[PDB]
Design a binder for these strands. Structure first.
Length: 10
DNA sequence: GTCACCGAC
């Protein structure tokens, strides 16, 4: 996720 | 986080 908690995705 | 397979903590 994010960053934080990438994306999704990448 | 939650998948797509990458991201970039």
């Amino acid at each position: 996720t994010x960053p934080g908690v990438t994306x999704p995705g990448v």
